[PDB]
Design a protein around this ligand. Structure first.
Ligand SMILES: Nc1ncnc2c1ncn2[C@@H]1O[C@H](COP(=O)(O)OP(=O)(O)O)[C@@H](O)[C@H]1O
Ligand SMILES: Nc1ncnc2c1ncn2[C@@H]1O[C@H](COP(=O)(O)OP(=O)(O)O)[C@@H](O)[C@H]1O
Ligand SMILES: Nc1ncnc2c1ncn2[C@@H]1O[C@H](COP(=O)(O)OP(=O)(O)O)[C@@H](O)[C@H]1O
Ligand SMILES: [Mg+2]
Ligand SMILES: [Mg+2]
Ligand SMILES: [Mg+2]
Lengths: 516, 516, 516
């Protein structure tokens, strides 16, 4: 009598399961296609709270639409990974994924079994990775001209693109500055600050850091040049034993003596600081109001309760050692900056620590007229920082504008010739799926995809040009490398690998069991 | 401020409109594919009232699912037309239609504009009609051997197929009998009766008609041989003027005289009937109880209030003229039958009018153990009656089992070679769409569609055999004409034309506006 | 204290009123733009009952969306009028109207007062009517080649366009046949019948009429050649005085005598009919069952209770006089038809009265696979019948494909040069508004409107070609007159006048007061 599997449950099997997933994928892909490339357009997303995000950024859009559909969630993971590993090409990856799903449907409607499609995809994907390596050009991690093209390509189609030359130079300087001694780039050592102002061109690089604290006492200097900075993360307050201790006073005179002893301990703390040669002081903990006095009388700029993250970046920029024992503070622990100034910026008072010599962290101060405008500039700067970092780390790049996908597509078909059996249809499918990129670029530019594809495919055939792609302005096939349209090899390798792995995962599903 | 278009309304534009329709079509198609062919399976459909229909019949299924979706409704119209014009191939037509929609999607995703797809389809469809004429064989409307194969093919895969030889012979006799003098077949002159009994083999042809009435008075004979039948659709009651008239009686004696005068009028009516030589009488109106008496005294079998439809078929079978004036009833108006008997059949008393000489209407009495079993036998008999009728009328047939579709497909591709431009992709699409039939046949038989298609396509290429199709039992390509697997040209021509016109109609839609 | 004007009321003044109307107009226009021209697309409209309409037809769409917005309702009236007066160009007229509203907004945002805009529009419109007369070519009401181009142009872009040559010839024959002796065309004498069948090419012209009634008695002939038809709209039943009358019978013998007298009156009625020479009889009233007998004995085909509208059209086709006194029926009242046949069509029995000699009414029998497909063919046939009628009546045509609007636009700008003052801006606005047609045609064809407009405008400038328009296939400016793309002058004159009058009406509104 009673039901075995839960009654409160929907279930989709075989064809229905496949359709459910394929459909979800395609629909996710279709909602971001319009954003792709130079003539890409932006979405405005409103949440249930009435908050607005306007952005071109693929993965951002996908996160902000609060998608519940279980298969869509899988595709969105593709975009999230692309973001983590590369920082660019999120839309590309998702769109390729959707296309693989769509091409898989044609094969499944012919009765090719899912596992065979999967097998075929896996083969094509491996081959694509191999081909992508032969396709990439080598570049040096210090080739600023090429790094700058990498950044500018990233910003193309973003609306921040109006300022792409200036932005790219700044971004290339910034990333170059924080490259560690193992040759790696930590996106975190480039602090992004966002502040309203006259325009986007007011955006600047700061060799140093911005600190959202003010000097602890107005009697201290507001400005100081060639400063010797002290980083202290112990507190400048009267020290207190760990074991519970209480004073007992029985003589009225001894009353003052304890107060005075405490005042002296504090005076001594400041004197030890002065002795190191420091004129500027950032402290992670608190500073007794009396110590604040003494510091000011010594002409020392001090800030209290500085964010741990701030101390860590201040250290990186100036060469200072964060100290936990005032007793052990020497001149060798002090950091150095050309200028430390408290000044206002968009009506906020902050402490600028700038003109450091060889900073290991820096600040990109992004400026624009309005908050939402800035936010999007920032999102674009993030994309560029990403790919510039990838290039510096990998030393491998490829041409953009769909050229690489077409070359890939063309070679994969050659590969498919030698595949025997049904698996072959899957390999050709995979090949054809890649052309979604050059097609969408044209589509978004109001061009005719079918004919441009014909033209671009031709320029790649024989022993033609792997760099040939559609210029969505002139309408001609051009040499994208010569035009400076390039991207890190890592964008393509990741996007394709991600799309392949996730669609293979979905195509293996023959049963969906949803609850509640 | 206020909304222009109604607020209580959903709307789907461009891509969304196309998907909505394409999807609906495909889903309708997919729900009947499983029924197609020799290894086709049946659906059991339950309505909101708890009534059951189990059937293989495509259009029946689609009517019984109470489909609300507006695009689906359009596809269902394809099945309904096929039923009206042919009586068979409803599943085929719907499945082809779905396939055309699916192939259209691939072209639309490449950015081929809908109107171009449409144009292409129209071309292919016209070409197909031309090709179908050259593909058809001629047959004579009196070729019983070929007509019998036509019927048997129809019944294959129906469960009534257990009795297909017997059924086919009966069906062919039946249709042959009602062919008019212009060579046309009216499916209506073959009355189908359904009655439970020992088995389906008890099913028989009746040269004559079954009447659901009993003789009007038990004093009349139950049986009568070589009968002279009278058809009267005026009433045997006392006649009454149209102008209002009343009798006035003032003399007591004249009281009887009026009653007697009426009795005489009735006696005279019967005597006029006897004088024509009639021993059996069917009357469309009523018969005064006194006339019933006189008729019985004269040994005349009479039935009253016979359905107009019954009178009309009785007339067609026996050669009688339905008369409206008893005065004008002569022996030349009488019909003839070998046997008129009232007898029981499944516990029901009815009047059999059988063994007529050259009947122009006839009765197929269908027998089976249970109601739902009979119903389906009947549905199959209907299909066969249809195609036999089509063959007799058209004189053109083609080979079955997917052979004709494959030949069509192959030729249409040849045609497409000479199409310049984008329209060509649509023509090839159309061609490939047709192969859904041979694919589904194999699929339903658990065979591998991809390889059998390869084999069948090969048998058709060069100057091979237009009759080559997959035998879903042996697994081989065989000569379907030699195996007696044939269908009226009209089933292919209509199915294809219907699918083409309705999918073209849908593909022209770019906006869906639904209310409430 | 209490409110003066009703409290349950919204109100929009000045700017808000203007925006409300302008907006409504534009939105209505925008919903039908997509349907315009050769590459136009169709909408699928679902009502609250779940009934579907799929159509390209502008005014049909606007009627089926149940639009409540008060200003939209006004624009819809534009479409309805175009339908009544012309039968084609409904979309054109509505789109022009929207455009006038949009161009009016630009002028209102510059602070040009509404009345001045209005004044300007009125001037432009009057000028346009004058210019349209000089632009039109003359044609003879019997120039079948030109009438045929007119029809084909009409059907272009409709999906019935697949059969446009055949359809056009039939339509031209049909309209030509019903032209009266004052040279006018009543669209009502061309009866449209819709019946499913093998395909749209089965569509045919019937010189005569279809009657949905079967012969009254099966004993009558089903077919009859060179028939003499009798039209009777009195009844063939026993006549009854107006003054109340009753028979009194006192003698039993006189009983029969009254019945017989009535039978004789009926026999006499039939005999009088036979005497006129008639073999076929259509009666608007009833026919006594006994008369039906006598008629059949005389070999006369008769139908009873024929729709008044049917009698009227039967008369028009055959040359018969509908008679109300059987006594006064002579041979000169009889009509003539080559063939009168009762036969089946899509499983329906009807009476065909065809092959009449010089019919003054005819039937277009439209055929297609499915109901919704047919409906739309019919809608297109209606459009063509309309413009063919217009041409025959007016004798004036103009070139299509936007050429005329461009010529108009160009001349109206010339006119505006000599307008002094602000009114001038309104005249140039009007001029520019007309270009919405050539723009939308291109747009719908995926072409670039801005550049094609530049090209077309050039071909018209100087003393160029008034017939020059965009070919939306080749992409070139071509001679639309040479390509046979033509329309009745009435389509442009009415569309423009309608748009002008209704937008002027709306622009005069400064206050909207809505209730409830
Ligand atoms: N100047 C250009 N011309 C053509 N294509 C370009 C140009 N600049 C960038 N692209 C292409 O646009 C695509 C990336 O666009 P974008 O909207 O940033 O998507 P994603 O989120 O996937 O990076 C890449 O194929 C890139 O090569
Ligand atoms: N013996 C057979 N072998 C292969 N195919 C057959 C055979 N008999 C019938 N068919 C095919 O089955 C199809 C019709 O199957 P059916 O289930 O009746 O569908 P429909 O409702 O479309 O007629 C036709 O394509 C016909 O060629
Ligand atoms: N072959 C053609 N080439 C270009 N334009 C055409 C052609 N045939 C018709 N047209 C144009 O299409 C327009 C009519 O389109 P249609 O969708 O019927 O709208 P409407 O309901 O307003 O008549 C007219 O401007 C006519 O000139
Ligand atoms: Mg990018
Ligand atoms: Mg069948
Ligand atoms: Mg039109």
């Amino acid at each position: 009598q009673p039901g075995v599997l839960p009654e409160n449950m929907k279930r989709y099997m075989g064809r229905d399961a496949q359709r459910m997933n394929i459909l979800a994928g395609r629909i996710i892909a279709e909602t971001v296609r319009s954003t792709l490339g130079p003539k890409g357009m932006d979405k405005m997303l409103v949440d249930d709270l009435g908050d607005v995000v306007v952005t071109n950024d693929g993965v951002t859009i996908l996160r902000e639409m609060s998608v519940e559909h279980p298969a869509a969630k899988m595709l969105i993971e593709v975009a999230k990974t692309q973001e983590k590993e590369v920082g660019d090409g999120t839309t590309t990856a998702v769109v390729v994924a959707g296309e693989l799903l769509r091409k898989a449907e044609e094969l499944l409607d012919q009765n090719v079994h899912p596992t065979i499609v999967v097998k075929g995809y896996q083969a094509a994907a491996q081959k694509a990775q191999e081909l992508l390596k032969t396709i990439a050009c080598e570049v040096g991690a210090q080739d600023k001209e090429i790094l700058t093209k990498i950044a500018m390509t990233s910003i193309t189609g973003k609306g921040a693109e109006k300022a792409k030359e200036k932005l790219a130079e700044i971004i290339v300087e910034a990333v170059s500055a924080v490259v560690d001694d193992e040759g790696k780039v930590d996106k975190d050592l480039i602090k992004i600050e966002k502040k309203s102002g006259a325009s986007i061109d007011d955006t600047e690089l700061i060799k140093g850091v911005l600190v959202d604290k003010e000097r602890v006492s107005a009697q201290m200097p507001k400005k100081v040049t060639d400063a010797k900075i002290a980083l202290l993360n112990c507190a400048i307050e009267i020290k207190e034993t760990e074991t519970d201790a209480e004073i007992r006073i029985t003589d009225p005179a001894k009353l003052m003596e304890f107060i005075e002893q405490e005042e002296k301990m504090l005076k001594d703390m400041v004197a030890e600081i002065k002795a190191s040669g420091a004129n500027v002081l950032f402290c992670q903990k608190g500073i007794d109001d009396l110590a604040q006095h003494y510091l000011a009388k010594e002409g020392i700029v001090a800030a209290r309760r500085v964010k741990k993250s701030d101390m860590e970046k201040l250290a990186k920029a100036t060469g200072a050692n964060v100290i936990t024992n005032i007793k052990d503070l020497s001149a060798q622990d002090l950091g150095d900056a050309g200028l430390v100034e408290e000044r206002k910026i968009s009506g906020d008072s902050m402490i600028f620590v700038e003109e450091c010599k060889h900073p290991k962290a820096v600040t990109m101060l992004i400026r624009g007229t309005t908050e939402h405008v800035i936010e999007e500039v920032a999102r674009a700067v993030d994309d560029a920082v990403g790919v510039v970092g990838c290039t510096i780390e990998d030393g491998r790049i490829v041409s953009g504008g769909g050229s690489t996908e077409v070359e890939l597509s063309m070679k994969l078909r050659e590969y498919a010739e030698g595949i025997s059996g049904r698996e072959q249809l899957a390999v050709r499918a995979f090949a054809d799926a890649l052309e979604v990129i050059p097609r969408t670029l044209a589509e978004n530019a109001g061009l005719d995809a079918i004919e441009i594809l014909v033209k671009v495919r031709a320029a790649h055939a024989s022993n033609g040009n792997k760099c040939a792609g559609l210029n969505v302005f002139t309408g001609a096939v051009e040499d994208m490398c010569e035009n400076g349209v390039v991207e890190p090899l890592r964008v393509k390798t990741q996007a394709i690998q991600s799309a392949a792995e996730s669609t293979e995962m979905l195509l293996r599903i023959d049963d969906v069991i949803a609850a509640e």
